[PDB]
Amino acid sequence: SMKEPSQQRVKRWGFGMDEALKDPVGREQFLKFLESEFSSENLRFWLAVEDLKKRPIKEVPSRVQEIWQEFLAPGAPSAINLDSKSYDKTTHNVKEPGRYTFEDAQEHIYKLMKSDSYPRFIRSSAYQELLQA
Amino acid sequence: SMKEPSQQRVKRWGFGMDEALKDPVGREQFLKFLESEFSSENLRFWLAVEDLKKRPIKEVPSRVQEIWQEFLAPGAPSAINLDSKSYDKTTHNVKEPGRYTFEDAQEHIYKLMKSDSYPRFIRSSAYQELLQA
Ligand SMILES: [Cl-]
């Protein structure tokens, strides 16, 4: 059987959330507390996403839908609150898997073009000749 | 046959990149210009991602892979430059479709637990009782 956690081990859980989460007993105690006050949805969602990262790839589509059904869908039994930006991204990912793969890259490239490609075009002889016409 | 773009139309492309892009003759001219100076990869990538967002969903995985191959894979013929953050997110999405569906939400929730769930656990009787006894 497991040995009683030492004083130092228990104290170390109060040094930061990562400390508590990496210790399996610390993590158990953190969750048990939150359940006792009906406030565990956030940690349970975090743990469900951690589990998602380890699953075999062919399982991902069904597991993604399970997490959405449990935590984020309409009427979800463990509903969590997100900021609008992160909610929006998530819904698009769940409902349109793969479609938004390049979303952050595309926003980066759009911003660059506004500062480089497009201003060069407006300055070009090609554009001036179309103005004339 | 098409008529020559009026002076008013050509002028309009100068009120913002969005104006140039939504006019299909403006888009054509912008691209033609960038190709003449060998700097069109950024717009070509942008246009490929716009196209992706219109494709049927069953076609999205193969199309995602085709965009990765043309602009982003090793030795891509139309290689683009991204910032590290964008490139990391993109690679994960391409190589592990679906797995990072909840990335931004999980980060939101992780940071929230640092300010809410975690402190509540440490100040609880449950934790403080352990420490004492
Ligand atoms: Cl409290």
Closest CA to B64 of A116, A71, A48, A96: A96
Query: Residue B90 in contact with residue A104, Cβ under 8 Å?
Result: yes
CB contacts of A36 in chain B (<8 Å) are 126
Distance to chain B for A121, nearest Cα, Å? 6
Query: Residue A55 in contact with residue B92, Cβ under 8 Å?
Result: no
Query: Which of B101, B122, B128, B129 has the most A C-beta neighbours within 10 Å, making it the best mutation to test the interface with A?
Result: B101
Return the percent helix, strand and coil in chain A, to nearest 5: 70, 0, 30
B89 lies in which domain range? 1-133
Count CB atoms within 10 A of the CB of residue A132: 6
**Would you call A131 and B98 a contact, using CB atoms and an 8 Å cutoff?**
no
Residue burial B92-114, b: 16+ Cβ < 10 Å; e: rest = ebbeebbbbbbbbbbebbbebbe
Report in angstroms the alpha-carbon separations of B60 from A95, A105, B87. Answer: 13, 17, 19
Kindly give, in sequence order, each residue whose CB lies less than 8 Å from that of residue A83, ignoring residues fewer than 6 positions away. B108
Q: In whole angstroms, what is the distance from residue A45 CA to residue B67 CA?
A: 32
Structural domain tally of chain A?
1
Task: Report the alpha-carbon angle B63-B67-B72, nearest 5.
Answer: 150
Distance to chain A for B17, nearest Cα, Å? 6
Count CB atoms within 10 A of the CB of residue A92: 15
DSSP secondary structure code for residue A54 in this structure: H
**Would you call A126 and B82 a contact, using CB atoms and an 8 Å cutoff?**
no
Listed by the residue before each break, gaps in chain B with C–N over 2.5 Å are: none
Return the percent helix, strand and coil in chain B, to nearest 5: 70, 0, 30
| CATH number, domain containing residue B90 | 1.10.167.10
Nearest CA in chain A to B47: A106
